[PDB]
Amino acid sequence: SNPWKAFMEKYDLERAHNSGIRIDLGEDAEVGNSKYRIPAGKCPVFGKGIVIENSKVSFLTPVATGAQRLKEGGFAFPNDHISPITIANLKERYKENADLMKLNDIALCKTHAASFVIAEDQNTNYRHPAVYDEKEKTCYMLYLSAQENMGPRYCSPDDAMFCFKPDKNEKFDNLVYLSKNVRNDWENKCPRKNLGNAKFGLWVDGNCEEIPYVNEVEARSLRECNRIVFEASASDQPRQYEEELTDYEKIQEGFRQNNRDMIKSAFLPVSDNFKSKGRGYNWANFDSVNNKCYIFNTKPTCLINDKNFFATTALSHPQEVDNEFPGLEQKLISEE
């Protein structure tokens, strides 16, 4: 009988998250004529952002408009004043909604972004993803659901181009990448902090054993190990994915022309086998002393108390640590 069973439910990311992490495109959504995939993840992704190649422009900057080339803007809404919105203004806006007033900041931000529809559209399941900036208490609505455009035709050393990749780096620490499906009760159902003095294990015959199969990768810090596991996690799109028909000029035209459907579907792949459903190398045990990152793809079912280690996941914050090792395995002993 496993004492860890309920505690470990939040580390069952196939069930907890149920979509891609590095690239989340787990749900089919109609945009105009065609069917595309959009983020479907039920867990927030802490520390994740989109990096635009050869651009100093943040992806949180609004999408290009008018004269601006694609590379002069980001992925966000260009502004009813709905994005970027602060949590103060958010709380103010929905003060009459009881249910929304019981939501935490991250859930409120996601709820706000996922609420906006075009009435004159044939009520689709498409909704905009979000990015919550915890430091600034600001909620961004993303115009683009697309997470990576790194294909070797256009996105190899050869300016009218718009190449981008998902990434975890210091500039993104306080960001939370949010799909329209992020759980309101994510705080109890999803990971956030790295578990200090802990390593994930597998409950076998009344004891917490090591993960049977792992991939050792060199990592010099907690940040580095957390980045490795994100980079190896469940992905809904293969690396270097590219479509032949992709026309940057038509796309850039659609943006300058404020064509909502073209902007919305920009760089999105068009099948069910491309969906990870949460399966992948999502967990890692970082050995802070020997500088090793042991990534694995089978869900952990217990924790081992080991002061040399940290238990991280692809969803987890790049730095935040919970050093409180759970005592749920400690037994009552008698003085007698």
Author numbering: 52 to 130, 133 to 211, 216 to 327, 332 to 397
Original paper wording:
Apical Membrane Antigen 1 (AMA1), a type 1 transmembrane protein of the Plasmodium parasite, includes an ectodomain, a transmembrane region and a cytoplasmic domain. The ectodomain comprises three domains referred to as Domain 1, Domain 2 and Domain 3. AMA1 appears to be essential for invasion since, for several Plasmodium species, antibodies raised against the ectoplasmic region of the protein have been shown to inhibit invasion, and immunization with AMA1 in animal models protects against infection.
The free PkAMA1 protein crystallized in space group C2 with two molecules (A and B) in the asymmetric unit and the structure was refined at 2.45 Å resolution. The polypeptide chain of molecule A was traced from Ser52 to Glu397 (thus including eight residues of the c-myc tag), with main-chain gaps Ala131-Asp132, Ser212-Lys215 and Gly328-Asn331 due to conformational mobility. Molecule B was built from Ser52 to Asp398 with main-chain gaps Ser212-Ala217 and Gly328-Ser332. Interestingly, the D2 loop adopts a different conformation in PkAMA1 to that which has been observed in PfAMA1.
